[PDB]
Write an enzyme that holds these catalytic residues in place. Structure first.
Site, PDB file in Angstrom:
ATOM      1  N   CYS A   1       0.799  -1.182   0.177  1.00 15.44           N
ATOM      2  CA  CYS A   1      -0.048  -0.118   0.143  1.00 15.44           C
ATOM      3  C   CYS A   1       0.926   1.279   0.073  1.00 15.44           C
ATOM      4  CB  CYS A   1      -0.953  -0.290   1.112  1.00 15.44           C
ATOM      5  SG  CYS A   1      -1.940   1.632   1.516  1.00 15.44           S
TER       6      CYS A   1
ATOM      7  N   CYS B   1      -0.432   4.072   2.196  1.00 12.64           N
ATOM      8  CA  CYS B   1      -0.320   3.935   3.609  1.00 12.64           C
ATOM      9  C   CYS B   1       1.089   4.522   4.028  1.00 12.64           C
ATOM     10  CB  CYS B   1      -0.397   2.450   4.139  1.00 12.64           C
ATOM     11  SG  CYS B   1      -1.949   1.519   3.588  1.00 12.64           S
TER      12      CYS B   1
END
Length: 108
Positions: free
Chosen positions: A31, A34
Site C-alpha cells: 500500500c 499507507c
C-alpha cells in the site's frame, strides 16, 4: 511507531481498552498511500495521547481478521469504543480522519 495488533491480539486489546477511543490503521505491505500517511499518523498519536492509535497489517497471516472485519481498501481506518466500531473511512485522507476523530473524541 504505532502499536501493532494481530489476529490473536486485536479483540483482547479492544476488550481491555474500556471505552477509550481506539483508531485502527489497517494497512498492507503493498500500500503506497499507507506509507504516505504513516508519519502524520505517528504525529497525531503523539499529540492526541487521549486516543489509542494502533495498526494491523492485513496479510495472509491475519487473513481471518481481514475477512471477519470485511476490510476492502488499503488503508482503512476503524474507530472503536467498548469493543464496537463507531465509525470507519477508507483511503489516506488525513484531513477526513482528523475530522472523524474530533467528531468522536474532541480535543481538550
Amino acid at each position: 511507531g504505532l502499536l501493532q495488533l494481530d489476529k490473536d491480539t486485536f479483540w483482547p486489546y479492544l476488550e481491555q481498552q474500556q471505552d477509550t477511543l481506539v483508531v485502527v490503521d489497517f494497512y498492507t505491505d503493498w500500500c503506497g498511500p499507507c506509507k504516505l500517511i504513516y508519519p502524520e499518523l505517528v504525529k497525531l498519536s503523539q499529540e492526541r495521547t487521549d486516543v489509542r492509535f494502533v495498526k494491523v497489517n492485513c496479510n495472509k497471516s491475519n487473513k481471518e481478521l481481514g475477512m471477519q472485519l470485511a476490510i476492502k481498501v488499503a488503508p482503512t481506518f476503524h474507530l472503536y469504543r467498548n469493543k464496537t466500531k463507531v465509525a470507519d473511512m477508507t483511503g489516506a485522507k488525513m484531513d477526513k480522519l482528523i475530522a472523524l476523530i474530533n467528531q468522536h473524541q474532541p480535543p481538550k
